[PDB]
Automatic annotation (TrEMBL), chains A, B, C, D, E, F:
Keywords assigned by UniProt, alphabetized: Calcium, Hydrolase, Metal-binding
Annotated GO MF terms: hydrolase activity; identical protein binding; metal ion binding
Pfam families to which the protein is assigned, alphabetical: BD-FAE
Domain of life: Bacteria
Protein name: Lipase/esterase
Length: 275, 275, 275, 275, 275, 275
């Protein structure tokens, strides 16, 4: 296993990525190309939450895929998240394509993972990057690669839907109201989506994920949705690994099966080798 | 996550280790000390099998523990495995103790994992390192640290028990017949053991693991034993990750739950935080 | 000791930092959080002087603190230093806060060091970052962390005060005349300052430091000022380590005690453990 | 030999460089300063071709010079190549000057290599960077260093001359028509040029290189030109090393002597030690 | 290109290797496995000459092969070169086999290069490793891999043949007189050999190489021999790259074609792709 | 500044070194060769104390010298310290000579530092390495380099003199009674020594250092001796940097000037540039 930490510059606003590369198993006769998952952590667009980076990355790596953690654009400074964050997701994917030979990467299996605030970036991208008109509008010309499916964990979907709380904050993320609501950007061309949240989420209302899923169904796009009956926002792995010390509110033993479900879902979609 | 590849020299025969360090989660208020698992791959004492290194290491890392992969002494050259391999397991543990500050390592939770040939080294160590008389005999004086529990996956236990096949091969591993049979070295001081194998193992007869477990019970030492009804030798993770390309004989969906069992067992023993 | 060389991107103009991390001492029972000092070298805003980077960094490290060397914005290109350099100092501090767990960093003890041209960036920041109105104006919204004290070595303070020599050069650094004079930005909210220079400085008149100190006193802010009676500009460590080969004009044995004074001053302010 | 991979930020649009540093030979009594060659690969301004990076870099390293591979600005996004790419070539050179002590670099021997699309960037730079009026216009103020000679392999020279094929593509590279034709920017101040191409080039007509050479002659600048009678575009090393697997059209045994010619030419110009 | 510096421990006397790995070219559709050359520098068994390491390594890398530089056992201490050095050559080869997946290495094309003192180690190995009786005697049991051809540059062949000068020195290298003369160990099973030297060699008489070649012919083993009419011992690359500063005696323009000859020879033997 | 962590193998018992390399200052016209100090920490021959490694290393680096931390042989296993540790000190020095070109190292200024147990290794070496008869006896043949001076901090000198406490422990370190007493190995050929200790040392009686100094005087070898009137054993830097958390017994403000004295002493001896 190799760990790469790089700045990528092929975007208006350069960003940092941290890649976790799988090594080829030594006693194999033939070499295998592994899937790759790009992870966008949460952090309310003001930071990137460690809880939703390496603990999750490692979990997916255990199932035999490379992972890259993307440091998408934030509010810090006087900067806005959009459109820059979309340009960065595209750059990352493009960069992966250029790393396929060196690292055995199956470009037919690039997957996007989003959590809380990072879920907005992913959900929006799933809409924009699949629509020629919007690739042009949001400057994704000439970026190679395309993702195959997305995974949303307690995602922020509509900015008018509960998070954030004030019209100033919503516009600070973006003044582009076409990107405010990710479910309004779903078309049949959108890639399939594994979505989960808890019903008792309070900082990012469950309505967010639901509206997205509703949009995928109505546009006949393959989706799977797990709304667990309990648990706070930002459960991450929902177990001891991502549990803040002392605080039992970060433990949910039923939500904690989400990775197993997600992985099984990837297999169903033909995006991960099956047992 | 950091990856360290080092030669350790505080043993008669220097060896290579590859350590996979957990990083502290950024948005924690207080820092946490994680458990650490040392992994001894299989390879019939002639090599170290990649299949039983990083795929397993990564799997355990996902449950929130550091891992170190130990390149124990091999037959290559005209060298023997013993006593040198025991000295190396002790050196590794000692070295970990010196790395605890830098990496947040819970020395009350050092765990040893063994697979096939690597299982012999571990099972033997669990006997020797816990017996003052044998620490002296096998030169473990002044090595700090002590492991807390061991995990054996389809282990080689008695060298007179099926593997290897010829009296020459057995002596090439070691001329020390006191180390030939790891179950004869079990005493109440032995640390607890999670053991698993398949009943249809042919290169290393199931009798090996059984005899060990039988010894642990009879010396009133806490143990757990999972003998799956089917599957070849060297299943590793028993899933797509460690499956040799094309060959379905490396897939066992029932044996594949061993990690989940093992981890739950570690929790029971108080050696891994519980959910 | 670890050495990190990274581009940081959470600012309009991305920059390079070189961090020198202290490692936890192995034979300590409990872990300790160390202070951290950010160093801005001189170079007349056209380059970063090596003399004022690692030789100084190492000197402070010896007293038991992490150091980061910041490559603040320069005139090169057609670029200006301001406002970008202020955004970068804030980004660096913010980034440190996100590295505190991994490296044991005491965020109640972040310190800023400035030399010659780098002194302007620091002195200005000490004014801006402490004034809510100016954090907003100069785009420091949402940057975590705050420094505790600053250290100025032969600093450039007022751009109308001797350095640079022509009105073109002054405006090339910045057209923002509110940032021209760092002493006019001092308010009671400014953090404490250790200031030193030589009286015989010719490229950056001693008047610069003096005016700053005068402003700190008049706003009742804790400060300490050492104006050595002799020596050229850019003495750095004033000893053999930073002495240009052959040239004795870079040796001043009385100015060379500045680090000892500075460190003792940090102790007085409670920003460095005391003996 | 050391390998460095860094983002450089002292330009409007930050870029990645990959440097291959020569190490000092251990059994030398005195240390030697080696030349350095900057390489701009081809890729039609949409990507950087691996074929024209390390295989070429390594080839030149064998003749005893450091190499740096520059990731010049691309069309990707909605970005244009110019003026940014010129700023980046200057930044790279400047950065090298700051690395001379650490790596023994002979700044009187910085050389620029260009291939296909990368040849345009180099050829243009050879014109701009040598003309005070154009350094000012294209923002190369305060960048230290200057190259000594350039090398063009099947270069794109005039954008109205065959590559690219549509007026949209030409303007997407740049709307600045003063940079469209690199031969119109040649003056006596231009540095000497080693130029080669194949006569049967179809994607970038041989006319391109010819027009450049013609301009160098007419301005009395030292140049050498090798137009091989056969071979496709993008032959690179023209041998097995850069040959796409299976495709014999990337093999030209006569064009394959270009490196030997180029190196001998560097010696003639006093830019590489001679045998 | 990646650079690896590792201690290998699977030998009685652990040794350092420095590997220079080729990276897969990014714009290839299919991946290619490259040959690998192991280089044993000279140094009179008291040191390893830098002149015969990276300058040569890089030269071969340019022709599209990985290289590893082996730090074979030396006289330093009271240690002898043999048998340990043979064990180390075998370990290196074995280790390469375990690195083939990760680095695309063609194990049907492992090549050994020897210079001066390093030539003895190689020439001897070519005899021992190919003779079952001698693999057993010199402890090469269970080492995977086998080399395909060897390359000797001004090699030391018979220790009674001019180098070294005193019977004490000869025995300090080894008391094993069966290894004193490498030509007496040639049998039809020996791998093919490219040999070169200068006729005016004085520290290691030309007779050495000649006797070896004579042995290869008489055992009907494919060999090629280039005895250049002039030049001192230890010419290395014979050009400016390996020329000690000031001393023209390290320049031979006719001997300097040896790499081109050697590479062409590798192609003839089917051990390097041909143009 | 670069940090190197390597195993060295040119000794019977391979060892780890951690080197801290000074980088050349960028804005120097000419390059300078720096001194290098090798540090042997304490630890009672059972471990290497972190307190006496990087905190001290960094302190000396601040005065403008490279440092290497040597992991000398320990009792761990059933191993003895001698003769192996002497072979390792010689190997380290030899290795440095081979690193001089790459890192600008002044081989006329190699210095050895010893603390507590590490002081024995140094003091003994200062005797052995300077006596042709003893280089032969203790196998230092063919190791290049030689140290210039040594520094002993609260050193263990005579093993019959207080440390260790039992005749078993003394022999476990070494059965070679010729190495038991380092002061009995002093001859005029011994290099100069800076020695310090506290008079109230209880685990290693002050008599140890005194006897050494007495031997240096009586053999007319230049020495300097600072016996501070108070303080425990293992004060290290005697300040907050090496102070175990909470325990004031590791603070001695008078002993804490030892580095300043030592450095000034190095200048007097011409082994460090003077101000």
């Amino acid at each position: 296993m190799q760990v790469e930490q790089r700045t990528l510059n092929t975007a208006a606003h350069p960003f940092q990525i941290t890649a976790y590369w799988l090594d080829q198993i030594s006693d194999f006769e033939t070499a295998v190309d592994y899937p790759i998952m790009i992870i966008c952590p949460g952090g309310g667009f003001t930071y990137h939450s460690g809880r939703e980076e390496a603990p999750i990355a490692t979990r997916m790596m255990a199932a035999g895929m490379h992972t890259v953690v993307l440091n998408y654009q934030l509010i810090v400074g006087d900067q806005s998240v959009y459109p820059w964050a979309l340009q960065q997701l595209g750059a990352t994917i493009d960069w992966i394509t250029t790393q396929a030979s060196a690292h055995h990467v199956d470009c037919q299996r690039i997957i996007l993972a989003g959590f809380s605030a990072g879920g907005h970036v992913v959900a929006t991208y799933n809409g924009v990057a699949t629509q020629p008109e919007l690739r042009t509008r949001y400057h994704l010309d000439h970026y190679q690669g395309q993702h195959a499916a997305i995974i949303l964990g307690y995602p922020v979907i509509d900015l008018t839907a509960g998070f954030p709380t004030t019209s100033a904050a919503r516009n600070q993320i973006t003044t582009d109201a076409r990107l405010w609501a990710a479910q309004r950007l779903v078309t049949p061309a959108s890639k399939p989506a594994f979505v989960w949240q808890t019903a008792t989420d309070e900082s990012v209302p469950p309505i967010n994920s639901l509206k997205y899923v509703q949009a995928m169904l109505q546009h006949q796009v393959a989706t799977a949705y797990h709304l667990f009956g309990s648990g706070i926002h930002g459960l991450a792995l929902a177990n001891h690994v991502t549990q803040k010390p002392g605080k039992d509110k970060y433990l949910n033993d039923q939500a904690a099966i989400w990775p197993q479900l997600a992985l099984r879902w990837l297999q169903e979609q033909g995006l991960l080798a099956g047992n």
